[PDB]
Design a protein around this ligand. Structure first.
Ligand code: HEM
Ligand SMILES: Oc1c(Cl)cc(Cl)cc1Cl
Length: 153
């Protein structure tokens, strides 16, 4: 549970993401793959890419960053009332992609890093704390789903 004020701070910084969804999505994915290379092993698509410039030139990676952030943005806008949005996401990520909760922690980290790097003025401590709680609630809810689907204990 976040307060209305905490949700506003989340949505305030997310509006800056929506000015350039693709660019943010590329920075988030590249940060994830750099910080946690094992996550890039959930792939052929662009498993192979070796330099940052190669990563930035990949159409596939750019599409993928938009796929993630579009879906996360719709979730955040629900302000916790997100069971319908998480249902299909949990289904694919538990039963087809098989993404462990620890990878969702890794991407949450990357998200926070990029937001702080790009919008420090709209991502001070209170805003950081709100985004952390929103991303935590997401993780918690998706983990309960995963188990319902028989995945990951
Ligand atoms: C905030 C976190 C996440 C959101 C909102 C998200 C959302 C999505 C959406 C909307 C799709 C396309 C539809 C679907 O298959 O359900 C998808 C596909 C996929 N996602 Fe996630 N995702 C995130 C976490 C992850 C993480 C941590 C990985 C780590 C490797 C990952 C890799 C997968 C893969 C491999 C696909 C298939 C992509 C393809 O078709 O080429 N996702 N994701
Ligand atoms: O690493 C990812 C890839 Cl390759 C594709 C999607 Cl759609 C989402 C994520 Cl987080």
């Amino acid at each position: 549970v976040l307060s209305e004020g905490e949700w506003q701070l989340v949505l305030h910084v997310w509006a800056k993401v929506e000015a350039d969804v693709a660019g943010h999505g590329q920075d988030i994915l590249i940060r994830l793959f750099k910080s946690h290379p094992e996550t890039l092993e959930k792939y052929d698509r662009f498993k192979h890419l070796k330099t940052e410039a190669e990563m930035k030139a990949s159409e596939d990676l750019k599409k993928d960053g938009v796929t993630v952030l579009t879906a996360l943005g719709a979730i955040l806008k629900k302000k916790g009332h997100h069971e319908a949005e998480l249902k299909p996401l949990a289904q694919s990520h538990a039963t087809k992609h098989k993404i462990p909760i620890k990878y969702l922690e890794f991407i949450s980290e990357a998200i926070i890093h990029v937001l702080h790097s790009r919008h420090p003025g709209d991502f001070g401590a209170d805003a950081q704390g709100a985004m952390n709680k929103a991303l935590e609630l997401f993780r918690k809810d998706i983990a309960a789903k995963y188990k319902e689907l028989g995945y990951q204990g």
